């Protein structure tokens, strides 16, 4: 009727399924507004972009001089000679 005693060491030692098992299509309700996907990356974002996308030395210093949340885009295209010289993105977590 009841379990026998076991030492605490043995108790510590002793101690998956398909979610869509019964799945059928359902009609989409009209009250749902799905969030749009973030746009895919372009040619400005590559670490070795074509030289045209690169900005001028003046157009850069104006960009960092301007405070954030006032810029058209949150980045400026930059060219790096190697993957070794590509630094970490400072706004990744943000």
């Amino acid at each position: 009727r009841i379990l026998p005693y076991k030492p605490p060491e043995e108790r510590e030692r002793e101690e998956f399924y398909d979610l869509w098992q019964n799945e059928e299509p359902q009609p989409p309700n009209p009250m749902h507004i799905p969030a749009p996907k973030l746009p895919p990356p372009g040619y400005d974002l590559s670490y070795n972009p074509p030289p045209e996308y690169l900005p001028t030395k003046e157009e850069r210093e104006e960009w960092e001089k301007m405070d954030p949340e006032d810029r058209e885009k949150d980045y400026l295209p930059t060219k790096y000679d190697s993957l070794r010289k590509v630094p970490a993105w400072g706004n990744f977590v943000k």
Partner: protein, 254 residues
């Protein structure tokens, strides 16, 4: 109510039942899993596997980010370890199925695009550096999202492995992962144009090359013989740089 009973027990000197009540609490710092089961929430939020596949983009971006971030109070260390495991398990599925299609190098990181059952999945993985956390950043909000995504990916991984035929979860070698196997600590057992680009080829990755991105790209697109310096981790086909049977060596040095 349970937290109140733990506090009373802790504040009264009886630590034995306080530990007993803790086991009922299912704390993430000990289990490493989400505190509340979200099986029914995920099912009603994604009524079919197709809806789950369409929103894997944000799920993978979170989990690959937190697999590189330090351990916080909202998301403890054992929670991050499960994020590595799920992301590594997911990467193995694309390698076997050759579902990886595109990859892109950007100033924001590395972009991977895959095609699972006809849905395009795009996610961004940060470069392998010391990610910075400054300003007003709240990990409790992100902890809630991590909790949901880990449960979602775990169920997605199970179905994808079952569709192929492999058993889930894959066997994990703690000793090999300790040595630095990373993706190489998984063994995939059964249950009882893509795969030609680098098939009959052999690569050696130098120290200054990103091991995790390169190995994923090569192994998904056909390669079976990849080696690297022993500092990169256990699992290389060969370690000696003087091995004669090495066609390509990837370098990033002046």
């Amino acid at each position: 109510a349970l937290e109140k009973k733990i506090s009373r027990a802790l504040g009264r000197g009886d630590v034995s039942n306080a530990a007993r009540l803790e086991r009922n609490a299912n704390l993430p710092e000990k289990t490493g899993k989400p505190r509340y089961t979200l099986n029914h929430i995920i099912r009603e939020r994604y009524p079919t596997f197709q809806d789950a596949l369409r929103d894997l983009d944000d799920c993978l971006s979170m989990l690959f980010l937190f697999a590189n971030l330090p351990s916080t109070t909202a998301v403890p260390a054992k929670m991050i370890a499960r994020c590595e495991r799920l992301c590594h398990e997911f990467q193995h599925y694309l390698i076997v199925t050759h579902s990886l299609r595109k990859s892109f190098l950007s100033i924001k990181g590395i972009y991977y695009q895959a095609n699972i059952q006809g849905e395009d999945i795009l996610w961004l993985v940060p470069y392998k550096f010391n990610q910075r956390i400054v300003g007003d950043v709240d990990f409790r909000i992100m902890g809630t999202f991590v909790e949901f995504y880990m449960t979602l990916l775990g169920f997605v991984n199970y179905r994808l492995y079952t569709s192929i035929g492999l058993k889930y979860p894959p066997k994990f070698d703690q000793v090999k992962d300790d040595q630095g196997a990373e993706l190489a600590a998984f063994s995939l057992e059964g249950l009882n144009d893509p795969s030609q680009l680098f098939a009959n080829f052999t690569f050696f990755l130098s120290r200054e090359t990103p091991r995790q991105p390169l190995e994923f790209i090569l192994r998904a697109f056909g390669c079976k013989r990849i080696g690297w310096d022993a500092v990169l981790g256990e699992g290389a086909f060969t370690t000696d740089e003087s091995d004669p049977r090495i066609t390509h060596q990837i370098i990033d040095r002046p």
